[PDB]
Structures are given as structure tokens and as C-alpha cells.
Design a binder for this molecule. Structure first.
Ligand SMILES: O=C(O)[C@H]1CCCc2ccc(-c3ccc(Cl)cc3)cc21
Length: 133
């Protein structure tokens, strides 16, 4: 019953400060513009210990499967090759990506009927809010 409250199909309804977060990460102009337009569908499922997050959009489709606490290699939508670790901390999924001596953290939280995603790179935060599809 791990991650029960995250499981489902979610749709992005708002994004704040995402272009600035992507600049802080190092994403180039053309990818920022096309990526920032996307309104993805995030599909979260659990099978035993394995959590899968599948995200579908006009920009990119991605899929990650993982076990909490167990590092995995991820190719992000902006083509970074990162080493990722996802843990549960006080009911928040905390996803750390490491590449080229850099780090970014993505937190996914259940708040009311929404799933709230906070992406942090150094001092820059972006918030992306999802509703049930
Ligand atoms: O979330 C995902 O799985 C993907 C697929 C669905 C759409 C989308 C949009 C933008 C970015 C994205 C872009 C730039 C940066 Cl730095 C990080 C993430 C990542 C994604």
C-alpha cells in the first residue's frame, strides 16, 4: 500500500517558474520553449516493490521504474544522462538526479485532490500542479 495515494492518471494543469528552473539546469532555448508548452499526462502505478511513472506528452514520452532507495540510470526528456534515487520521506516522493557533478531534486506530494511537483535546482524552484485525469 506503498504510494497508494499517488497511483493513478494525472494531467498537468499549471506550471510556475519552469522556464527559470530549466535555465538553471542548463537546458537550451529550443528545448525550453517546446518542453515548456507540454501538458503531460503522468501515470503512476505500483506492482510489488516496483513503482512505475510513465509521462506522456506531445514533447516527449518517458517511463521510469524503480525500487525506493535503489539508484537507477535515467535519460531525462532534455537528454541528460543522470543517476537517480527516489525515496519516500514523510509521505513525499523525493527524486534526486545526479549528473556532471550537479544535482536537482524533484518532490511529488499529494495535496487535497492534486499532485504537486516541486523541482529545485540550486536556489530556483518550479511548481507543477496535476489533477486527476
Ligand atoms: O516529466 C517527464 O517525464 C517528461 C515527459 C513529459 C513532458 C516533460 C516535459 C518537460 C520535462 C523536463 C524538461 C526539462 C528539465 Cl530540466 C526537466 C524536465 C520532462 C518531461
Amino acid at each position: 500500500h506503498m504510494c497508494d495515494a499517488f497511483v493513478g492518471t494525472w494531467k498537468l494543469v499549471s506550471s510556475e517558474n519552469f522556464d527559470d528552473y530549466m535555465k538553471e539546469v542548463g537546458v537550451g532555448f529550443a528545448t525550453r520553449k517546446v518542453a515548456g508548452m507540454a501538458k503531460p499526462n503522468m501515470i503512476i502505478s505500483v506492482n510489488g516493490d516496483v513503482i512505475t511513472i510513465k509521462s506522456e506528452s506531445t514533447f516527449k514520452n518517458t517511463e521510469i521504474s524503480f525500487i525506493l532507495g535503489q539508484e537507477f540510470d535515467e535519460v531525462t526528456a532534455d537528454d541528460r544522462k543522470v543517476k537517480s534515487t527516489i525515496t519516500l520521506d514523510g509521505g513525499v516522493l523525493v527524486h534526486v538526479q545526479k549528473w556532471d557533478g550537479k544535482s536537482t531534486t524533484i518532490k511529488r506530494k499529494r495535496e487535497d485532490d492534486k499532485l504537486v511537483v516541486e523541482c529545485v535546482m540550486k536556489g530556483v524552484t518550479s511548481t507543477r500542479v496535476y489533477e486527476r485525469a
